[PDB]
Coordinates of C-alpha atoms and ligand atoms in Angstrom, one line a residue:
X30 CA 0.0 0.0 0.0
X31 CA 1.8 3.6 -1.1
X32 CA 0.4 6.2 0.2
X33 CA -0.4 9.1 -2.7
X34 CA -1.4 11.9 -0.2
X35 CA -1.2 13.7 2.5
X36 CA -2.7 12.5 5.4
X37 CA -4.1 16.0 6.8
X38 CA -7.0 18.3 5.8
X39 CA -5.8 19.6 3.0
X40 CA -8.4 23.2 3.5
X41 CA -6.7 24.0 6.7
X42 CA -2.7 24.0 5.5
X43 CA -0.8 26.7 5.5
X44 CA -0.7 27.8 1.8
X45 CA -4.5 28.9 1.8
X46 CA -3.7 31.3 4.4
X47 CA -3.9 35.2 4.1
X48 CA -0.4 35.9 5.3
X49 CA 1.0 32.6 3.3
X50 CA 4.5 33.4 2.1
X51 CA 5.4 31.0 -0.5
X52 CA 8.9 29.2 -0.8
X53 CA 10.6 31.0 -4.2
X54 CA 13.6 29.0 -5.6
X55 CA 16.7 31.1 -4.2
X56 CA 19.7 32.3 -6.9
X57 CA 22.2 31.3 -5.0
X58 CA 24.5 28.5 -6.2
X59 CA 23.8 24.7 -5.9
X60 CA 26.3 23.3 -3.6
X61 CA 26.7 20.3 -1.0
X62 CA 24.5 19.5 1.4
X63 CA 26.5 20.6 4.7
X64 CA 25.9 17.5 7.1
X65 CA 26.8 18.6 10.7
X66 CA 29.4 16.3 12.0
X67 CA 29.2 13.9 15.5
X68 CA 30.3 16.1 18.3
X69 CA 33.1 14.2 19.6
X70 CA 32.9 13.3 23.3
X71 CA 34.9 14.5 26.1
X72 CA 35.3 11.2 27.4
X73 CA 33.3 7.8 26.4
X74 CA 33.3 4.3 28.1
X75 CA 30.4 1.5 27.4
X76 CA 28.3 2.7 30.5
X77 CA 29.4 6.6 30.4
X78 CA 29.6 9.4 28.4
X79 CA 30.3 12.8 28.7
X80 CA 29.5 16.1 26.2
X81 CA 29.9 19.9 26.4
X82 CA 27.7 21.5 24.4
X83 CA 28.6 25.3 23.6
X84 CA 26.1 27.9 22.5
X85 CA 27.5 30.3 20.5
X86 CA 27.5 32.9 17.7
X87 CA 29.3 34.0 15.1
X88 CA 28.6 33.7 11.7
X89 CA 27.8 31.4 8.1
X90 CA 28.4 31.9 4.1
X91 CA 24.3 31.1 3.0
X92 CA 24.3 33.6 0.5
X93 CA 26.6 35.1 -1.5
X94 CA 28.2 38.2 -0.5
X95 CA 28.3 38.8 3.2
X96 CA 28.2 36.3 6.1
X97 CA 25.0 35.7 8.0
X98 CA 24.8 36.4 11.3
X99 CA 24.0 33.0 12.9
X100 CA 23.6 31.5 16.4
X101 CA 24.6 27.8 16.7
X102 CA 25.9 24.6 19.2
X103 CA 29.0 24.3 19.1
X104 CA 29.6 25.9 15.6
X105 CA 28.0 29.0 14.2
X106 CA 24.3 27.6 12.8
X107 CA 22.8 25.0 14.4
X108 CA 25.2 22.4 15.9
X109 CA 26.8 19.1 16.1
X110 CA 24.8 16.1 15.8
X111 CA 24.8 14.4 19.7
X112 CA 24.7 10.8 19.9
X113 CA 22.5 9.2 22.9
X114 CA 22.2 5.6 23.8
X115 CA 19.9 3.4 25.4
X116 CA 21.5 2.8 29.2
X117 CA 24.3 4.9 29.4
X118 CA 24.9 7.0 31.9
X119 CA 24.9 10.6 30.0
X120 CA 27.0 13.7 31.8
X121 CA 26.1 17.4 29.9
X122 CA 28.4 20.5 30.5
X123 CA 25.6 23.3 28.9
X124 CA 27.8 26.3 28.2
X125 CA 26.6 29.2 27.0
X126 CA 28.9 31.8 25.4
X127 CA 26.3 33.8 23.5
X128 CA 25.7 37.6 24.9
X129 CA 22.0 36.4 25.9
X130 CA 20.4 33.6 28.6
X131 CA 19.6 30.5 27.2
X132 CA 18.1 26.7 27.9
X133 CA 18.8 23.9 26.2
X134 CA 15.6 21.7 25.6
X135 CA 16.1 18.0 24.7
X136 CA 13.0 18.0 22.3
X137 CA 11.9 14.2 23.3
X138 CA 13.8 13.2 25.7
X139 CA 12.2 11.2 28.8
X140 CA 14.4 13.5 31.4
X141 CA 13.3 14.7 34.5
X142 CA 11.8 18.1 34.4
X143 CA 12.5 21.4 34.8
X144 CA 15.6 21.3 34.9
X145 CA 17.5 18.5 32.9
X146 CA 14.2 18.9 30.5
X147 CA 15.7 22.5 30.2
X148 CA 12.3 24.4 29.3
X149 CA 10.9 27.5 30.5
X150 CA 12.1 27.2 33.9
X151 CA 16.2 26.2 32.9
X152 CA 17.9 29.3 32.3
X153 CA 21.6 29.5 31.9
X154 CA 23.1 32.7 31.8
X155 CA 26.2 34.1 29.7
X156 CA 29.4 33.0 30.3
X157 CA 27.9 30.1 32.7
X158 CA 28.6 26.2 32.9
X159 CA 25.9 23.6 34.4
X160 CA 26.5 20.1 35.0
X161 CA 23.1 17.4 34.0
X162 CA 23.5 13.9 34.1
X163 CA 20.7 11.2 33.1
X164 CA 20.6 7.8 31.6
X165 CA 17.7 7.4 28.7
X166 CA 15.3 4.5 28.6
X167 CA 13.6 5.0 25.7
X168 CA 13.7 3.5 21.9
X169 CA 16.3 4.4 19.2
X170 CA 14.8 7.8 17.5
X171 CA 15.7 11.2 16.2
X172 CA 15.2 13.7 18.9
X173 CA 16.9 17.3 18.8
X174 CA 18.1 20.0 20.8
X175 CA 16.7 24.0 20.8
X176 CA 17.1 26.7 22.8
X177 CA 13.6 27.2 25.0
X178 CA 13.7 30.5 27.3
X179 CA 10.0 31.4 27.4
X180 CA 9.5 33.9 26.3
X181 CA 11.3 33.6 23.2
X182 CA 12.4 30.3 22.0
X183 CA 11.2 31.6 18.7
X184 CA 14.2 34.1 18.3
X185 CA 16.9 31.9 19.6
X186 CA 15.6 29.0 17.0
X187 CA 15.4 31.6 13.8
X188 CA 18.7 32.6 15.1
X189 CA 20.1 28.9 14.6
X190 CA 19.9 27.1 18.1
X191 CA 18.7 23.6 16.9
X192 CA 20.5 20.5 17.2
X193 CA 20.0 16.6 15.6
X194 CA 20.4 14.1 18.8
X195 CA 20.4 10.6 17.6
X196 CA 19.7 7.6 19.9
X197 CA 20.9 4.6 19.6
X198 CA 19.6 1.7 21.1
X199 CA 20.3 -2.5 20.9
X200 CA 17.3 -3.4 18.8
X201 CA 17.6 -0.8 16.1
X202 CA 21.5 -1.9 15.6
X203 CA 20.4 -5.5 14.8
X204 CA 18.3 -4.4 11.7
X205 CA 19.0 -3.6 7.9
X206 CA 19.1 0.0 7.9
X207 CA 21.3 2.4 6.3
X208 CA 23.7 3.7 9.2
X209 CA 26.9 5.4 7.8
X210 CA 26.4 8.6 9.3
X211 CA 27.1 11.1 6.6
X212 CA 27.5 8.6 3.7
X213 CA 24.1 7.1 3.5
X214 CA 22.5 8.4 6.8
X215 CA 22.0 12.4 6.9
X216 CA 20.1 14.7 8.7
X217 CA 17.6 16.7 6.8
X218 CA 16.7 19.4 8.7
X219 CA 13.8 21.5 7.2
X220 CA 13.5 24.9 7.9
X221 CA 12.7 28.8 6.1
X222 CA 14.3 32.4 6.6
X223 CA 14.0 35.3 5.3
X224 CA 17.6 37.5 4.3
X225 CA 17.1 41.1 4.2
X226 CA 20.1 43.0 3.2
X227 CA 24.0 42.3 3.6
X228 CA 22.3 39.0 3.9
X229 CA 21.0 39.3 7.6
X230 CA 18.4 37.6 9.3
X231 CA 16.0 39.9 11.3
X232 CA 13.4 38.1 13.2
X233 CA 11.7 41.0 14.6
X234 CA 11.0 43.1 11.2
X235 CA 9.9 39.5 9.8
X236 CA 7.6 38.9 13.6
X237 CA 4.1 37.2 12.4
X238 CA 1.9 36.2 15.8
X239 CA 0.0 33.5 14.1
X240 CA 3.9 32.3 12.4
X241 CA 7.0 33.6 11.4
X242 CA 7.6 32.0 7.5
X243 CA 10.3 33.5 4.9
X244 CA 10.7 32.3 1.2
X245 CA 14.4 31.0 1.3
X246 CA 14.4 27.1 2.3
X247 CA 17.4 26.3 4.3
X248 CA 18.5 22.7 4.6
X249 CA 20.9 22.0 7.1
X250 CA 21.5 25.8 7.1
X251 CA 22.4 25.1 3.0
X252 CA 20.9 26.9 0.4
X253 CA 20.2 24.9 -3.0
X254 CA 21.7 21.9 -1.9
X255 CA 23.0 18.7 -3.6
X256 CA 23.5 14.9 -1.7
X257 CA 25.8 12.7 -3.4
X258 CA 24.9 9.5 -3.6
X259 CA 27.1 6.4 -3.3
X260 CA 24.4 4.1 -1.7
X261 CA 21.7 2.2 -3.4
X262 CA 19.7 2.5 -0.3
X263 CA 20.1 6.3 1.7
X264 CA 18.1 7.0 5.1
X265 CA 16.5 10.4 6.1
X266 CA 16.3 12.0 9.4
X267 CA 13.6 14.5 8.5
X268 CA 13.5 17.0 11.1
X269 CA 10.7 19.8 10.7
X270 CA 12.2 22.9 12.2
X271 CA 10.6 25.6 10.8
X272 CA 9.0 28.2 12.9
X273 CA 5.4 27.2 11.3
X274 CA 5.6 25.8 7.9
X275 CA 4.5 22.6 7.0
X276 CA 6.6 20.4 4.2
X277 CA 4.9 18.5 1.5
X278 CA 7.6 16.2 0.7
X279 CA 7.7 14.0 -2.7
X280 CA 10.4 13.3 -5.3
X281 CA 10.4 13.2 -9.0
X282 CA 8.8 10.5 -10.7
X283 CA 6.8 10.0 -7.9
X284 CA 9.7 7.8 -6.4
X285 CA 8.8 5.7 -3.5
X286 CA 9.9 5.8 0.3
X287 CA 9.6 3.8 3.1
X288 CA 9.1 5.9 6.5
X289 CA 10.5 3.3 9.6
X290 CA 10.9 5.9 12.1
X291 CA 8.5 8.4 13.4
X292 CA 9.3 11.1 16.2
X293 CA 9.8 8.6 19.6
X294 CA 10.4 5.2 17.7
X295 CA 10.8 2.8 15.1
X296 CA 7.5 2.5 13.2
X297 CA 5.8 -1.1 13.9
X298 CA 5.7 -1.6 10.3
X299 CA 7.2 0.2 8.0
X300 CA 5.3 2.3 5.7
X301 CA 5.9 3.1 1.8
X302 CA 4.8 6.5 0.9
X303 CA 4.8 8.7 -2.3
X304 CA 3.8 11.8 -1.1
X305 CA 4.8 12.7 2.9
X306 CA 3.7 15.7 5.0
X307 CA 5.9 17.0 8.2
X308 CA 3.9 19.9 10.9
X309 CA 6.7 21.5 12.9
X310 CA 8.7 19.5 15.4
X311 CA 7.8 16.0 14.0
X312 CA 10.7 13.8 12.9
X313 CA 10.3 11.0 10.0
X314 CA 13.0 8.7 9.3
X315 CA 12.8 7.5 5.8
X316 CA 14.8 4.7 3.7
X317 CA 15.1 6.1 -0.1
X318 CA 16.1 3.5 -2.6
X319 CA 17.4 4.7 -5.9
X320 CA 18.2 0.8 -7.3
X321 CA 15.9 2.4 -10.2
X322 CA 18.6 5.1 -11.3
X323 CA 21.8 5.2 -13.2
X324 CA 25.3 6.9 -12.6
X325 CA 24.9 10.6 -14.0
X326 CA 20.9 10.7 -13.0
X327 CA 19.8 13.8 -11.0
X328 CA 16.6 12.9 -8.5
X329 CA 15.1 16.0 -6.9
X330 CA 13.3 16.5 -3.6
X331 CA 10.2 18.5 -3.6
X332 CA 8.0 20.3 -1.5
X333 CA 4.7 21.4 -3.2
X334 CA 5.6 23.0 -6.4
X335 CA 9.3 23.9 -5.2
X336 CA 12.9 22.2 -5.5
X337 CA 14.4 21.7 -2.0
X338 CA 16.8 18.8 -2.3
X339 CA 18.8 17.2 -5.7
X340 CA 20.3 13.9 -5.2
X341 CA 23.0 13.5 -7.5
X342 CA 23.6 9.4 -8.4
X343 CA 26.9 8.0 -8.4
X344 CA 28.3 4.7 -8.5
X345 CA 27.1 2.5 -5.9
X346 CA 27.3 -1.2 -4.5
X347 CA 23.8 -2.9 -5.2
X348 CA 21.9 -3.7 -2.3
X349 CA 20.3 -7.0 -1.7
X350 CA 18.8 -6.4 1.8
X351 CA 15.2 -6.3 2.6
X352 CA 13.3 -4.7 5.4
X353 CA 11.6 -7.3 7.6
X354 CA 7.9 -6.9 8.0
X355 CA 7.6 -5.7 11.7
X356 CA 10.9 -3.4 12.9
X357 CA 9.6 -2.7 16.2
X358 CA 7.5 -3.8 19.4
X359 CA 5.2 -1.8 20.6
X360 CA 4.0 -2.3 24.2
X361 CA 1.4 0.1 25.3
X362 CA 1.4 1.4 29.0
X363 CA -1.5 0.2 30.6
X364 CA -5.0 2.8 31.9
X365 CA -5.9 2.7 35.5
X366 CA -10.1 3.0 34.3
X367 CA -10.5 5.1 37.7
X368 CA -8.8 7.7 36.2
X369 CA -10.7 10.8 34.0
X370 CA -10.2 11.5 30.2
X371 CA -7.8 14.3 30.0
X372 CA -9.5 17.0 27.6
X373 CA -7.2 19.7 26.3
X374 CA -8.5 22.1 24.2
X375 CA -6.0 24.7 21.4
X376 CA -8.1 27.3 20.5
X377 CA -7.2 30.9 18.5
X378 CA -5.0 31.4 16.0
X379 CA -2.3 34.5 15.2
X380 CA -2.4 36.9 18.9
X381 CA -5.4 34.8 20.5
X382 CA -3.9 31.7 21.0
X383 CA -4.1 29.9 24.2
X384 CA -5.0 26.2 26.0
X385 CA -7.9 25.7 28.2
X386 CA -9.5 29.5 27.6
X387 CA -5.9 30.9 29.0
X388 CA -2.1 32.0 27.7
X389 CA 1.0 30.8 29.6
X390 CA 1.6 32.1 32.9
X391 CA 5.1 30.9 33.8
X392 CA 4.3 30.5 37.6
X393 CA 1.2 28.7 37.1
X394 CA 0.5 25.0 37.5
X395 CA -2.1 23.9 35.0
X396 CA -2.4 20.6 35.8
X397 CA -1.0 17.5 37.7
X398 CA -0.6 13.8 37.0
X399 CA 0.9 10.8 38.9
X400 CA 4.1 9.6 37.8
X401 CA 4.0 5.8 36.4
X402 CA 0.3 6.0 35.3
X403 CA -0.7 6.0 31.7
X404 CA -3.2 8.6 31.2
X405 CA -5.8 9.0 27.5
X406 CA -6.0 12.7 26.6
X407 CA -8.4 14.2 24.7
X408 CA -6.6 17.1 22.9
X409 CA -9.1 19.0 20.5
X410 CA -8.1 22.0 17.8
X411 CA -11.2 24.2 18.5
X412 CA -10.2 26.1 15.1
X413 CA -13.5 26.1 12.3
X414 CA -12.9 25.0 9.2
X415 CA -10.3 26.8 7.2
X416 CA -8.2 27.5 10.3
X417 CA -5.0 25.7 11.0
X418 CA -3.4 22.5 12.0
X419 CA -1.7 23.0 15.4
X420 CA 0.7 20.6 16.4
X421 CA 0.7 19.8 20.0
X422 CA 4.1 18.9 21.9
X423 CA 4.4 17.1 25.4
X424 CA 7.7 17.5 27.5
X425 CA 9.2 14.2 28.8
X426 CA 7.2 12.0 27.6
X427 CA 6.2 9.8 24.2
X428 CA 2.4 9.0 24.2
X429 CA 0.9 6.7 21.8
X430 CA -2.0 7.9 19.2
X431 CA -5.0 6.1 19.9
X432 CA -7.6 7.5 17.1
X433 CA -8.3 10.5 15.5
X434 CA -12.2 11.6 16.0
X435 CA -12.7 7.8 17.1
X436 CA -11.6 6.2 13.8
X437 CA -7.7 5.2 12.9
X438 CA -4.6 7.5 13.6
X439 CA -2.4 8.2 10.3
X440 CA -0.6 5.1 8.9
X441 CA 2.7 6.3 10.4
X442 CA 1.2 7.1 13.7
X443 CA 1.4 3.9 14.9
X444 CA 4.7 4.1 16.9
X445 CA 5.6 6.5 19.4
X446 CA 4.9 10.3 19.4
X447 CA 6.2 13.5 21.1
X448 CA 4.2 15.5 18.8
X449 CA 0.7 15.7 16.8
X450 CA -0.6 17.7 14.1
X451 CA -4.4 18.1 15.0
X452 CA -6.7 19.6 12.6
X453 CA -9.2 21.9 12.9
X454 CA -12.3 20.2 14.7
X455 CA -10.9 17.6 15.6
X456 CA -10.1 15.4 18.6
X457 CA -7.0 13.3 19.1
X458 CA -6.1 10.6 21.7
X459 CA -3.6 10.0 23.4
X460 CA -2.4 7.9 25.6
X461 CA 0.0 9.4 27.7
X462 CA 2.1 8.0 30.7
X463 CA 5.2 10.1 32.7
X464 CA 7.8 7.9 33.9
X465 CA 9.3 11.0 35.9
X466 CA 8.2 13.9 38.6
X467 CA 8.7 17.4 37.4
X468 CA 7.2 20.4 36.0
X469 CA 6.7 19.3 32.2
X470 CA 5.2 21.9 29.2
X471 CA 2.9 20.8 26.4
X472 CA 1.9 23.4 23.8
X473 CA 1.7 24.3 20.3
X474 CA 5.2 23.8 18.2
X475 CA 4.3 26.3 16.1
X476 CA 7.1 28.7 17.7
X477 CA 5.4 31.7 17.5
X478 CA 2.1 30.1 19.1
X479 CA 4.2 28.7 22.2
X480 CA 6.1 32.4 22.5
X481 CA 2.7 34.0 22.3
X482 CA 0.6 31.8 25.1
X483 CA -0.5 28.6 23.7
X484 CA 1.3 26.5 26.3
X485 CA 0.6 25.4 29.7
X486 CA 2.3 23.0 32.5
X487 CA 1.8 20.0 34.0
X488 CA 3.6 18.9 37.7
X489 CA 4.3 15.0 37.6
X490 CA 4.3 13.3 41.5
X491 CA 5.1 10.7 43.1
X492 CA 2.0 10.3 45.1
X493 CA 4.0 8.5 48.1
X494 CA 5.8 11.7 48.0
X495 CA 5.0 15.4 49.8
X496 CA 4.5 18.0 47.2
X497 CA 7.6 18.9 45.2
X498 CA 9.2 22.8 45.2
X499 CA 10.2 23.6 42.2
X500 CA 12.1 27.3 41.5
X501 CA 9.8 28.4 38.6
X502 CA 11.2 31.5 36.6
X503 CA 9.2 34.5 36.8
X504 CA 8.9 37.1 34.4
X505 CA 10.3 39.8 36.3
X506 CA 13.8 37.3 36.5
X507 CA 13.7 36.9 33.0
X508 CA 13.5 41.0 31.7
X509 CA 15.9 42.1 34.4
X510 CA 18.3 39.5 32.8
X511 CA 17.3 40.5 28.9
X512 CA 17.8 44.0 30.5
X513 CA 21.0 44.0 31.4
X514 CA 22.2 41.4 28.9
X515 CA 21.5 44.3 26.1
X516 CA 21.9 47.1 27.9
X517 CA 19.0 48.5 27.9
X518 CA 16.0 49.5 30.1
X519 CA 13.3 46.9 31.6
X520 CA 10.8 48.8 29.7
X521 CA 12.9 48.7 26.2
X522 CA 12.8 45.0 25.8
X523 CA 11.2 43.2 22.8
X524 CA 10.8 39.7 22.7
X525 CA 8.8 37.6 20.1
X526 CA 5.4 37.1 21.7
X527 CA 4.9 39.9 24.1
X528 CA 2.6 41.6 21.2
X529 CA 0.2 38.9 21.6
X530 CA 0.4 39.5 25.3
X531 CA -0.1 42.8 25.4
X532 CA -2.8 43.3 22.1
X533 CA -5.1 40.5 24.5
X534 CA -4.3 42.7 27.9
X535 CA -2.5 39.6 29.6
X536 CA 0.6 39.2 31.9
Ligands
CU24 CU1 10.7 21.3 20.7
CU25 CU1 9.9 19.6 23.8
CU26 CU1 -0.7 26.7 17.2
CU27 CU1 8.5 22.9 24.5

């Protein structure tokens, strides 16, 4: 069974909105798809391994002419790809060297919360050095890092904090997938700017409320890019890290691909598709197999109408492997039927966004949960019918998708989840279990929704346990430090996201 088309309500996507900005093919010239290499370790055993991961800026020929200004981990745009696994003990020197605070979120990690989960409430300051250590028991996946002070994690992201984290498990080494990371394994990170001149990014000039969208794709922060070949058989880390827009992947010739990896795990089964679409923050790992093709041939990755991706074919070994028919075991965390239907409702779009009839309040607890116990939520897009798909994101955890308006989640939806596209009207569940106490986020991913209120928090307990105190950030923290950081008054600050705050009347 290929799948011909997109899975989601094809009135409510992005291009039939008013504000849509349309992906134009840029001039610049075709060149190699930069793939970010491994950050090396410090210091690696078989049960231990220990990382320093550097924010930093400086900046990144994109265009030509002059240099981009660009934030990035470890390098100057975006960062080196980390490498997790399964069991071993994991030791995290965050250092930040850019002139602003900063927190360093690992986007679908099972980590204990606020701290190591490093959301809202995870600050670390210029200059500074904090230690986290945690061992991950979770499947092999693509996860990745970003920056997430709240507010604005949409700044910090536009200005290149985003990170591949790859984790490796036992099972997923025993099967026959590509794996030669950088050869026939890549990252493709998807994401959109806009340059303004002497080739400059400028967030705040480009600010949208309802999402922040420029015309310039940027692939592994390359423009025009080309993959060489040398593999019958290539895998794809899709990462969607756009601010808000929504890829509509396909290939010339309408060439195949099997998906065997969504955002939290290996698929079940794995799932041949012709036409593939990504909401912001979910991952899809794809196997590409160009057996079809001869040496000289030029395949090209689309989205919609627009050229993103040319693979160029070389030479290559023929492949003989096969994928078996189930890669993965799922086991679904069991539902104590005492327990209440969580309902969560995303309603608003562009400055009126919020959960539950509210905007974020940073000190406020919107909800609690007992660790170990496998919870359904409801979670409904209130939006009428064009509207928008919103994707919803839970920290520290991956829930399973149970149905969509009581009928059959998506065909690659069968695996584990961090993140959901949920279309207007429409009801998903979930079934969601925390394995860890802490104070946990779960919003829109749409970056300029989560900056302008449409988030909330949930405390995980322990219910043998006393009631946990946790230092929350506070808003008043946060501007003093943004204050002085830029040298500049309290009153003076701009961040991504107060305009939605302060057009509704909200704190
Ligand atoms: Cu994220
Ligand atoms: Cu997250
Ligand atoms: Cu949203
Ligand atoms: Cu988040």
């Amino acid at each position: 069974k290929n799948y011909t088309d997109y899975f989601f309500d094809e009135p409510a996507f992005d291009l039939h909105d008013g504000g849509y900005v349309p992906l134009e093919v840029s001039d610049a010239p075709e060149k190699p798809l930069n793939v970010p290499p491994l950050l090396k370790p410090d210091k690696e055993t078989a049960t231990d391994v220990y990382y320093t991961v550097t924010a930093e800026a400086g900046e990144t020929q994109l265009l030509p002419g002059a240099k981009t200004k660009t934030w990035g981990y470890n390098t100057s745009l975006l960062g080196q790809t980390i490498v997790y696994r399964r069991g071993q003990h994991t030791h995290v020197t965050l250092k930040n060297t850019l002139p602003e605070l900063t927190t360093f979120h690992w986007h679908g990690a099972n980590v204990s919360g606020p701290y190591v989960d490093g959301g809202c409430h995870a600050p670390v300051y210029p200059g500074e050095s904090k230690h986290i250590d945690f061992t991950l028991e979770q499947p092999a996946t693509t996860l990745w890092l970003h920056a997430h002070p709240c507010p604005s994690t949409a700044e910090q992201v536009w200005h290149g904090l985003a990170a591949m984290v790859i984790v490796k498990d036992d099972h997923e080494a025993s099967l026959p997938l590509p794996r030669n990371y950088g050869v026939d394994d890549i990252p493709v990170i998807l994401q959109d700017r806009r340059f303004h001149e002497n080739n400059q990014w400028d967030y705040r000039a480009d600010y949208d409320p309802d999402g922040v969208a420029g015309p310039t794709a940027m692939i592994n922060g390359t423009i025009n890019p080309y993959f060489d070949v040398t593999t019958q058989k290539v895998r794809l880390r899709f990462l969607n890290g756009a601010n808000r827009r929504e890829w509509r992947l396909h290939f010339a010739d309408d060439l195949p691909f099997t998906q065997i990896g969504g955002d939290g795990s290996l698929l079940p089964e794995p799932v041949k598709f012709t036409h593939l679409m990504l909401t912001c923050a979910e991952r899809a790992e794809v196997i590409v197999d160009f057996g079809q093709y001869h040496e000289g041939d030029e395949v090209t990755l689309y989205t919609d109408d627009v050229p993103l991706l040319k693979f160029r074919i070389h030479a290559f070994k023929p492949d003989q492997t096969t994928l078996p028919d189930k890669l993965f075991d799922v086991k679904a965390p069991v539902v104590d039927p005492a327990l209440p239907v969580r309902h969560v409702v995303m309603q608003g779009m562009d400055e009126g966004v919020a959960i539950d009839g509210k905007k974020f309040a940073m000190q406020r607890i919107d909800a609690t949960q007992p660790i170990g116990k496998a919870q359904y939520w409801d979670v409904t897009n209130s939006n009428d019918a064009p509207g928008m798909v919103h994707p919803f994101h839970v920290h520290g955890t991956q829930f399973l998708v149970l149905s969509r308006n009581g009928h059959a989640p998506y065909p690659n939806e069968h695996g584990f989840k961090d993140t959901i596209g949920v279309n207007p009207g429409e009801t998903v569940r979930l079934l969601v279990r925390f394995d860890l106490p802490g104070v946990y986020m779960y919003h829109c991913h749409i970056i300029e929704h989560l900056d302008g209120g449409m988030m909330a928090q949930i405390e995980t307990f322990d219910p043998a346990k006393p009631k946990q105190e946790y230092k929350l950030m506070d808003m008043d923290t946060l501007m003093m430090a943004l204050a002085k950081e830029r040298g500049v008054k309290p009153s003076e600050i701009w961040m991504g996201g107060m305009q939605s705050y302060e057009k509704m009347g909200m704190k």
